[PDB]
């Protein structure tokens, strides 16, 4: 009812130079006919919500993946997306993309563009505050990317509840070039007492939220929706918030423990409506389709299959004004 | 009648 | 106690050409070691709440007739400064002056620059949203100047209740040059349709209106105020809405009526709290020095002394969350 699965979607991307050059094989399979929703690897099957090929473009994956987030935060729900797969799969480009090019841009710049069109196409008399927090986990430390005195931040609980990130900024925007501007002011803040990007970028996570509050001004009703927009460390061997991810995963997935163990990261701490609680969460698993990855391939897909049984029960978050509680 | 963008600013 | 008197403020400008080539005598007199209050025409010695020189600097008449109403906003009360007087007598350059020279800027400006000064250097964790419009009313009709499809707008009165120009445009905006562009935005519309603006804008009403909003985060008290202000039609004969401006006064000032014209005109109905209701209101008088226009002069003097009998009475606007509202 409002028993909602956490989506599963897999991407494959090409196989890549240094897969070729050291005499990989294509090793993964896509049956037909079955909705694009599978991937056979060594002769087993795997169901996801959806699966994607080395061919299909940021668009096609958008527009399956991502589209009815945008919808649903507009309407009241919280919504997540996050990317999972180990380092080189695809994890970067399919949370962001190249910014700016019209056919190579990930999810991340097509939910802001969208978010803003459908705002402006709204004809109810709708009033939006959008702010966007932009932040970094390193070995369980978080560092804000828009604040570079804010490190070692600390996760706290809210009134009725929820979990933040304390001290974290909080930038108002009102238009996409105001968000891709913030983006660009994360991204070089990132770089600071940082020598190697890419590998630095491969042992974090890089979390973008954009929380979505609206009023009604012809009825007074309070809509709001925060939106996840991660991208994960790799999970290669295996960086201790990914061990917890994979904890809380199988714990909610069994089904059959009283302590999830939440509390056992800052990622998974914040992830914790995003995991079995109020949020309608889609994982991209992103994986190799190289031989040579296979193992890791494997351990991805495992990963996806069982995060595909966890059930999240969500709701639209609506606040009350006076009226309801004045007249009372 | 128009959807509109609020624009506030902080202090603290 | 929450009872405050319109204050009345007078400005005389210099002596100019086409006064003296008219061979024009300055006939008005400044008494001096009574706190500059003063000012005597023909014998006859006016108080107000502060006179003003030919010489005063632009930075003095805020000091004065202003700053005390940017404090007052951002405290949640409503404020309204208007500027009245014979056309050539000073009321643009009293309001509006010269926008971007550090000199003569005039009373709006400074009162956008220091709205933003006083929010970035509080230390209360504060949230505003600040939204204007700006429209004209000429010959009783109100054109949006920030929406040229919107003419013939009317006045409507809202739940708790207080008047609005319906269909107004309101805009947000988050920094002293968003305003400024707005500013532009409204004074270049303003030339549709009017073959020479010198002689336009000394016939009608120009208002700015600020909307101040604020949210303190830490104990959710929400406070808002108004800022009207408004740089009139000329005095002189006998603009039908300063008939009702002049209506409105007599009335207060009489206080012994049942019935105030506020419905005379929409400019009245559109200030009718800021003319013996709930803000805080500062009328500039504005005056020529010169024999020419003594006449004028003094009609103007006699309706600043009326307007500044007449009583306000203001209160903080202060609007209740749930917590307070929940409980009960
Ligand atoms: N579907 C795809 N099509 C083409 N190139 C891709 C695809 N996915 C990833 N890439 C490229 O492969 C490299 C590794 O991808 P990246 O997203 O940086 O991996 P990760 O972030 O998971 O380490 C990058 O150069 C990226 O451009
Ligand atoms: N205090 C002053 N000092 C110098 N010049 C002034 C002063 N007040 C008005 N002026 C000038 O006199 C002229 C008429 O003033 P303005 O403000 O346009 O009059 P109004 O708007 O009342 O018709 C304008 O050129 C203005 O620059
Ligand atoms: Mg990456
Ligand atoms: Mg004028």
């Given at each position: 009812p409002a028993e909602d699965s956490i989506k599963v979607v897999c991407r494959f991307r090409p196989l890549n130079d240094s897969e070729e050059k050291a005499?990989?094989?294509?090793?993964?399979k896509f049956p037909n006919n079955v909705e694009e929703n599978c991937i056979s690897i060594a002769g087993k099957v795997y169901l996801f919500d959806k699966v994607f090929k080395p061919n299909a473009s940021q668009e096609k994956v958008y527009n399956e993946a991502a589209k009815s987030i945008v919808t649903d935060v507009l309407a009241g729900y919280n919504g997540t997306i996050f990317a999972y797969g180990q380092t080189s799969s695809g994890k970067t480009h399919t949370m962001e993309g190249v910014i700016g090019d019209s056919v190579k841009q990930g999810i991340?710049?097509?939910?802001?563009?969208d978010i803003f069109?459908?705002?402006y196409a709204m004809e109810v008399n709708l009033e939006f505050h959008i702010k966007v927090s932009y932040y970094e986990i390193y070995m369980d430390k978080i560092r804000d990317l828009l604040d570079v005195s804010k490190v070692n931040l600390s996760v706290h609980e809210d009134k009725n509840r929820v979990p933040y990130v304390k001290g974290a900024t909080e930038r108002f925007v009102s238009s996409p070039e105001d968000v891709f501007e913030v983006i660009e002011?994360?991204?070089?803040?990132?770089h600071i007492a940082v020598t190697n990007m890419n590998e630095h970028s491969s042992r974090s996570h890089s979390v973008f939220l954009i929380n979505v509050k609206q009023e009604n001004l012809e009825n007074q009703k309070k809509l709001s929706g925060k939106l996840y927009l991660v991208d994960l460390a790799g999970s290669e061997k295996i960086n201790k918030s990914?061990?917890?991810?994979?904890?809380?995963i199988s714990a909610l997935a069994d089904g059959n423990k009283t302590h999830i163990p939440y509390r056992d990261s800052?990622?998974?701490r914040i992830?914790?409506?995003?995991?079995?609680?109020?949020?309608?969460?889609?994982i991209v698993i992103c994986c190799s389709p190289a031989s040579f990855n296979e193992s890791e391939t494997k351990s991805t897909l495992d990963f996806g299959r069982r995060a595909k049984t966890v059930k999240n029960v969500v709701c639209v978050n609506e606040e009350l004004t006076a009226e309801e509680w004045k007249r009372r | 009648p128009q959807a509109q963008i609020a624009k506030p600013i902080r202090s603290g």
């Amino acid at each position: 009812p409002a028993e909602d699965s956490i989506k599963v979607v897999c991407r494959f991307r090409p196989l890549n130079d240094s897969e070729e050059k050291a005499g990989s094989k294509f090793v993964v399979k896509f049956p037909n006919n079955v909705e694009e929703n599978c991937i056979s690897i060594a002769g087993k099957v795997y169901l996801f919500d959806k699966v994607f090929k080395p061919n299909a473009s940021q668009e096609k994956v958008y527009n399956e993946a991502a589209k009815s987030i945008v919808t649903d935060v507009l309407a009241g729900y919280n919504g997540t997306i996050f990317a999972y797969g180990q380092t080189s799969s695809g994890k970067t480009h399919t949370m962001e993309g190249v910014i700016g090019d019209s056919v190579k841009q990930g999810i991340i710049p097509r939910i802001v563009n969208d978010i803003f069109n459908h705002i402006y196409a709204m004809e109810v008399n709708l009033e939006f505050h959008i702010k966007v927090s932009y932040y970094e986990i390193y070995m369980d430390k978080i560092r804000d990317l828009l604040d570079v005195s804010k490190v070692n931040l600390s996760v706290h609980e809210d009134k009725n509840r929820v979990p933040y990130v304390k001290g974290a900024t909080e930038r108002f925007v009102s238009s996409p070039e105001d968000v891709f501007e913030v983006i660009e002011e994360g991204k070089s803040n990132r770089h600071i007492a940082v020598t190697n990007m890419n590998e630095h970028s491969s042992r974090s996570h890089s979390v973008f939220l954009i929380n979505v509050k609206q009023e009604n001004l012809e009825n007074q009703k309070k809509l709001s929706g925060k939106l996840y927009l991660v991208d994960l460390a790799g999970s290669e061997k295996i960086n201790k918030s990914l061990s917890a991810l994979g904890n809380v995963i199988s714990a909610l997935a069994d089904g059959n423990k009283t302590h999830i163990p939440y509390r056992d990261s800052k990622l998974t701490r914040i992830l914790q409506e995003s995991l079995g609680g109020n949020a309608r969460t889609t994982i991209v698993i992103c994986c190799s389709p190289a031989s040579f990855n296979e193992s890791e391939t494997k351990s991805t897909l495992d990963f996806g299959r069982r995060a595909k049984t966890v059930k999240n029960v969500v709701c639209v978050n609506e606040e009350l004004t006076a009226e309801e509680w004045k007249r009372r | 009648p128009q959807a509109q963008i609020a624009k506030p600013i902080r202090s603290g």
